[PDB]
């Protein structure tokens, strides 16, 4: 049987959230969000079964300047813990050297937030 | 004035309140007219795409036999489905054979034609002489322009890292400013005119 | 009476507009005021220390001036200083 | 990444922003994003936050819907799907992402989880209105 | 052997390009980009043009790629630096970089002008509802 591929994610609404009555459902069925359906479609097109989880550190990848060790989903990827990451990973030079990204599924930018004029 | 004024308290009450009303209303009319004549404000009829679908006075079409039409055709969003219905049931042909044809069609008309195109060329043209066009609303699709390479070339990883480094430091933004806004003819007060007949 | 009301109100309002606008007018008093606006063109001698100073400038405002400079005036620049003075005098405030 | 982007910026406008930035607000900066949102909500329009556009839209569509996104995007970046170096899930994943983007799937999911689940809504004349002169009629 | 296309403001011929010989007559965005790319990679390049479509595509019958894509597939060039759109069909036969410029579809309109004043523009300072309330308040008074 083709091995289940381990997917790393992170809690950040709406990308990944816990479905109402989490204890009721187990496994992937308890997770609801944009990234979950994206992973569903991607695995459907590739044709592999996946099991979700969450980065315990709860932080996006970053290296310790002195320890030279990655802290986050990048770590769970480059250290063999995880087989793919489906989350809002910003594309950067530091990560692109030690990780193989994909063409952006969501373009993005810095923007201005103000009080809604009553 | 008046050839007659009321003598009873009730008629005088009516007249007084009418007088107050008249005073306020005439003052307001004059003041708001002064505002209008002092500050020119030109409102674009459109600030989005749904506004464009609801409107029927304004016509809009893409370039015929292109990727934009292919996008609108295979769409699943409601607004773009409505736009596709319109463009498929439009007389005459909203579509066009060349970009310059669409630009000329927009310019010759007066607020009747709206052209759907790429953000970059639109931003460029909004800075060309004649500066008689502008871009409105957000973007209806996401795309990117990418450096290409043959399969197996040793230049893939270096160019990827080069574009990423340039983006992070800010070179590409500077070049865009240089070739779109700077090196751009029109950048980004007129005495008041006497009223005409 | 209606006609009179409209006409007198329009006269008063447009006169207020005239005077208000004539009161907004802030003339040029600095390099920035000249830099942002473009209704007036400004150019220096073709060859000289001023062209070099603007070209080789690391300041924001003069950088913007240089970006504007060398534009299609057709020729903001000039060859003789007397030429620049005459050009400014002939221009009805359209050259600095 | 926003503080670094402004600090390391070679653009005029963002250079001016950075010159203003680090001033005596006392603290324009913030530690938590929720902190910034709360600070903007409390301020009576006296604070403006700089953040990723996606979160700005999501918040704009969240109850009480008392904030808005304004202007274009200062920078331009992207979110991607990561696989470890030398993996068999590189080409297929990229192809799948691109196919989804052309098919319109990603835009539909965006609309669904940003607007079709927003607490708030979906989306002029300087002429004097009757509300301005109501007291006269009363 | 880089490649490019005259679509402005990406590639254009500098004023008095007869004087310029090669790789210096061209100007634009893509050319400066290729300069910086070569600088960060080291290699030397000679800007060229292709024509024959001006961009990539495929003929379903001939099954032969045309343009920049066609020449990259067949070795006629090293890389293509130009506003070349990322797409599924092309990524299957070549390799792209991360986008150096993201964009999307947008709406172009003619700039709103000072509208020719309309007959009965003297009522504009007040809303129609105010005028009707004025009429009926006159009646009632
Ligand atoms: N990899 S990342 O690049 O780590 C990163 C990835 C994904 C979302 C991020 C984010 C960062 N950031 O920069 O720290 C800040 C941030 N701030 C918000 O307010 C928000 O909603 N999302 C984010
Ligand atoms: N790869 S591409 O996709 O070939 C393509 C690449 C680059 C610019 C394009 C363009 C296409 N097109 O669709 O044909 C149409 C088009 N139309 C405009 O008006 C404009 O300014 N730029 C373009």
How many C-beta neighbours within 10 Å does residue D96 have?
Answer: 23
Is there a contact between B106 and E107 (Cβ–Cβ < 8 Å)? no
Query: DSSP class of residue B114?
Result: E
Is there a contact between E98 and A103 (Cβ–Cβ < 8 Å)? yes
**Distance (Å, whole) CA A52 – CA A10:** 10
For strands E57-58 and E65-66, give the pairing.
antiparallel
Q: Could you give the dihedral angle defined by the CA atoms of residues C53, C58, C63 and C65, in that order, rounded to the nearest 10 degrees?
A: -30
* CA distance to A35, A74, A118, C65, E71, per residue, from A59 (Å): 16, 10, 36, 46, 44
Q: Is E24 helix (H, G, I), strand (E, B) or coil?
A: coil
Deposited resolution, Å: 3.1
* CA distance to B169, C66, D17, E47, per residue, from D11 (Å): 10, 16, 10, 28
- Judged by CB atoms closer than 8 Å, whether chains meet at D15 and C60 is answered as yes
Query: Which H or E element spans position C67?
Result: helix C60-68
End-to-end Cα distance, chain C? 51
**Distance (Å, whole) CA B148 – CA E34:** 12
Chains near E with 3+ CB pairs less than 8 A apart are A, B, D
- Which residue owns the Cα nearest ligand 1 atom 20? D55
Is there a contact between B10 and B19 (Cβ–Cβ < 8 Å)? no
Breaks in chain D, named by the residue before each, with C–N above 2.5 Å? 123
Is there a contact between D51 and A113 (Cβ–Cβ < 8 Å)? yes
Instruction: State yes or no: cis peptide before D64, omega within 30 of 0.
Output: yes
D15-D21-D22 Cα angle (round to 5)? 130
Is there a contact between B61 and B28 (Cβ–Cβ < 8 Å)? no
Q: Which of A35, A14, A32 is CA-nearest to residue D57? A: A14
Is there a contact between C76 and C69 (Cβ–Cβ < 8 Å)? yes
**Distance (Å, whole) CA A21 – CA A12:** 18
How many C-beta neighbours within 10 Å does residue C88 have?
Answer: 14
**Distance (Å, whole) CA B189 – CA B39:** 9
Bridge partners for D77 per DSSP: A108
How many angstroms away from the CA of B90 is the closest CA of chain A? Answer: 33
Question: Is residue E25 annotated as involved in ligand binding?
Answer: no
Is there a contact between E45 and E2 (Cβ–Cβ < 8 Å)? yes
B157 touches chain E (CB under 8 A): no
**Distance (Å, whole) CA D80 – CA A73:** 13
Q: How was this structure determined?
A: cryo-EM
Query: DSSP class of residue E112?
Result: P
Partners of A101 on chain E (C-beta within 8 Å) are 98
Is there a contact between B83 and B60 (Cβ–Cβ < 8 Å)? yes
* CA distance to B86, B166, D106, per residue, from B62 (Å): 12, 33, 23
- Judged by CB atoms closer than 8 Å, whether chains meet at D128 and B32 is answered as yes
Q: Which of B53, B173, E116, A101 is CA-nearest to residue D83? A: A101
Cβ–ligand 2 distance for E53 under 6 Å, the answer no
**Distance (Å, whole) CA A85 – CA A74:** 8
Angle between helices D105-114 and D91-103 (to 10 degrees): 70
Write A114-118 long-range contacts (CB < 8 A, 24+). A114/D40, A114/D45, A114/D48, A114/D49, A114/D67, A114/D68, A114/D69, A114/D70, A115/D40, A115/D41, A115/D43, A115/D44, A115/D45, A115/D47, A115/D66, A115/D67, A115/D68, A116/D65, A116/D66, A116/D67, A116/D68, A117/D45, A117/D68
Is there a contact between D68 and D48 (Cβ–Cβ < 8 Å)? no
Is there a contact between A70 and A94 (Cβ–Cβ < 8 Å)? no
How many C-beta neighbours within 10 Å does residue B78 have?
Answer: 11
In this structure, chain D runs to a length of: 138
For A93, which of B142, B144, B161 is closest by C-beta distance?
B161
**Distance (Å, whole) CA A50 – CA A55:** 16
Is there contact between D and C if contact means ≥3 C-beta pairs under 8 Å? yes
Contacts of B100 (CB under 8 A, 6+ apart): none
**Distance (Å, whole) CA C76 – CA C68:** 10
**Distance (Å, whole) CA E114 – CA B43:** 10
Annotate C24-53 with DSSP letters as a single string.
H-----SHHHHHH--SSB---BSSSHHHHH
Q: Which of D97, B165, D114, D5 is CA-nearest to residue A106? A: D97
Q: Which of A72, A54, A62 is CA-nearest to residue A7? A: A54
Q: Is B116 helix (H, G, I), strand (E, B) or coil?
A: strand
Partners of A114 on chain D (C-beta within 8 Å) are 40, 45, 48-49, 67-70
Phi then psi for residue D79, to 5 deg, are -105, 140
Is there a contact between B33 and E125 (Cβ–Cβ < 8 Å)? yes
Q: Is D37 helix (H, G, I), strand (E, B) or coil?
A: helix
- Judged by CB atoms closer than 8 Å, whether chains meet at A91 and B161 is answered as no
Q: Which residue has the tokens 């043009």?
A: E49
Bridge partners for A110 per DSSP: D52
Ligand nearest to the CA of residue A106, numbered in listed order: 1
Bridge partners for B145 per DSSP: E85, E101
Angle between helices B156-169 and E29-41 (to 10 degrees): 110
Bridge partners for E96 per DSSP: B148
Is there contact between A and B if contact means ≥3 C-beta pairs under 8 Å? yes
Q: Which of D88, B165, D83, D95 is CA-nearest to residue A99? A: D83
**Distance (Å, whole) CA A108 – CA C60:** 29
CA E42 and chain centroid, separation: 28
Is there a contact between B178 and B124 (Cβ–Cβ < 8 Å)? no
Partners of E127 on chain D (C-beta within 8 Å) are 125, 127-130
Q: Which two tokens mark C12?
A: 């008063």
A60, A93, A109, A113: residue to mutate for ligand 1 pocket, most atoms within 8 A of CB:
A60
What radius of gyration do chain B's Cα atoms show?
28
**Distance (Å, whole) CA C57 – CA C66:** 9
Is there a contact between E139 and B14 (Cβ–Cβ < 8 Å)? no
Q: Is E27 helix (H, G, I), strand (E, B) or coil?
A: strand
A4 touches chain D (CB under 8 A): no
How many C-beta neighbours within 10 Å does residue D67 have?
Answer: 17
* CA distance to A10, A18, A30, per residue, from A22 (Å): 16, 6, 6
Angle between helices A34-46 and D105-114 (to 10 degrees): 160
B138-A105-E34 Cα angle (round to 5)? 85
SS (H, E, C) D45-114: CCCCEEEEHHHHHHHHCCCCCCEEEECCCCCCEEEEEEEECCCCCCHHHHHHHHHHHHHCHHHHHHHHHH
CA A34 and chain centroid, separation: 11
**Distance (Å, whole) CA B90 – CA B72:** 15
Q: Is C78 helix (H, G, I), strand (E, B) or coil?
A: strand
Q: Is the dihedral of CA B119, B134, A111, D63 positive or negative?
A: negative
Alpha helices in chain B, H assignment, sequence order: 9-38, 50-54, 67-73, 78-88, 99-108, 119-125, 156-169, 171-176
Annotate chain A with DSSP letters as a single string.
-PPPEEEE---BTTTBEEPSSGGGS-GGGGEESHHHHHHHHHHHHHT--EEE---TT-S---B-TTT--B-SHHHHHHTSS-SEEEEEEE--HHHHHHEE--S-SEEE-EEEEEE---
* CA distance to B156, E23, E100, per residue, from E44 (Å): 16, 11, 21
Partners of B71 on chain D (C-beta within 8 Å) are 104
Query: DSSP class of residue E123?
Result: G
End-to-end Cα distance, chain D? 57
Query: DSSP class of residue B28?
Result: H
Q: Which two tokens mark D18?
A: 């950075």
For strands E26-27 and E12-13, give the pairing.
antiparallel
Bridge partners for C33 per DSSP: none
**Distance (Å, whole) CA D77 – CA B20:** 61
């Amino acid at each position: 049987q083709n091995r289940t591929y381990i997917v790393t994610t992170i809690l950040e609404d709406p990308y990944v959230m816990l479905k109402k009555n989490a204890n009721q459902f187990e496994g992937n069925d308890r997770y609801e969000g944009y990234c979950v359906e994206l992973a569903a479609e991607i695995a459907k097109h590739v044709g592999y079964s996946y099991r979700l989880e969450i980065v315990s550190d709860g932080k996006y990848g970053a290296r310790d300047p002195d320890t030279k060790a990655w802290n986050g989903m990048v770590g769970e990827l480059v250290y063999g813990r995880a087989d793919v990451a489906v989350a809002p990973l910003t594309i950067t030079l530091v990560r692109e050297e030690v990780i193989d990204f994909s063409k952006p599924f969501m373009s993005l930018g810095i923007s201005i937030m103000i009080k809604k004029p009553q | 004035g008046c050839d007659i004024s009321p003598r009873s308290l009730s008629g005088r009450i009516v007249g007084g309140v009418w007088w107050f009303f008249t005073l306020i209303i005439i003052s307001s009319y004059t003041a708001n007219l002064a505002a209008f004549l002092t500050v020119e404000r030109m409102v674009s009829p459109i600030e989005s795409a749904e506004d464009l679908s609801k409107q029927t006075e304004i016509a809009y079409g893409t370039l015929d036999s292109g990727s934009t039409k292919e996008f609108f055709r295979r769409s699943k969003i409601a607004v773009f489905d409505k736009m596709w219905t319109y463009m498929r049931s439009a007389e005459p042909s909203v579509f066009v054979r060349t970009t310059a044809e669409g630009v000329a069609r927009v310019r010759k008309s007066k607020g009747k034609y709206a052209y759907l195109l790429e953000s970059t060329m639109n931003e460029y043209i909004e800075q060309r002489k004649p500066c008689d066009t502008m871009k409105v609303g957000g973007n209806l699709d996401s795309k990117g322009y990418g450096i290409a390479t043959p399969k197996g070339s040793s230049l893939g990883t270096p160019v990827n890292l080069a574009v990423l480094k340039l983006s992070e430091q800010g070179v590409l933004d500077k070049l865009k400013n240089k070739w779109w806004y700077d090196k751009g003819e029109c950048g980004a007060k007129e005495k008041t005119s006497a009223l005409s007949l | 009476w209606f006609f009179t009301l409209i006409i007198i109100s329009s006269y008063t309002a447009n006169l207020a507009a005239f005077l208000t606008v004539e009161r907004m007018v802030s003339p040029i008093e600095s390099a920035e005021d000249l830099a942002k606006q473009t209704e007036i063109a400004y150019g220096t001698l073709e060859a000289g220390s001023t062209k070099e100073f603007f070209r080789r400038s690391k300041i924001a405002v003069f950088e913007k001036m240089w970006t504007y400079m060398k534009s299609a005036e057709p020729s903001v620049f000039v060859r003789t200083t007397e030429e620049g003075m005459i050009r400014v005098r002939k221009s009805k405030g359209k050259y600095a | 990444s926003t503080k670094e982007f402004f600090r390391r910026s070679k653009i005029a406008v963002f250079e001016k922003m950075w010159t203003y930035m680090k001033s005596a607000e006392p603290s324009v900066f913030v530690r938590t994003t929720e902190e910034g949102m709360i600070r903007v909500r409390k301020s009576k329009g006296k604070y403006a936050y700089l953040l990723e556009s996606t979160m700005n839209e999501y918040i704009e569509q969240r109850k009480p819907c008392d904030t808005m996104k304004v202007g274009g995007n200062l920078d331009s970046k992207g979110y991607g799907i990561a696989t470890p170096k030398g993996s068999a899930l590189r080409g297929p994943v990229n192809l799948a992402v691109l196919k989804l983007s052309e098919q319109g799937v990603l835009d539909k999911l965006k609309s669904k989880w940003w607007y079709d689940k927003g607490e708030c809504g979906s989306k002029k004349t300087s002429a004097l209105s009757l509300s301005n002169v109501a007291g006269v009629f009363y | 052997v880089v490649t490019t296309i005259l679509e402005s403001p990406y590639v254009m011929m500098k004023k008095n390009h007869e004087m310029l010989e090669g790789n210096e007559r061209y100007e634009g965005y893509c050319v400066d980009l290729a300069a910086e790319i070569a600088k960060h990679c080291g290699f030397k390049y000679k800007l060229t043009i292709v024509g024959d479509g001006k961009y990539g595509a495929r003929d379903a019958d001939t099954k032969i790629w045309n343009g920049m894509v066609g020449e990259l597939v067949y070795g006629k060039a090293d890389i293509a630096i130009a506003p070349l759109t990322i797409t599924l069909v092309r990524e299957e036969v070549i390799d792209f970089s991360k986008p150096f410029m993201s964009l999307g579809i947008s709406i172009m309109i003619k700039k709103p002008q000072k509208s020719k004043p309309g007959v009965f523009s003297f009522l504009d300072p007040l809303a129609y509802e105010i005028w009707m309330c004025i009429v009926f308040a006159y009646i009632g008074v």
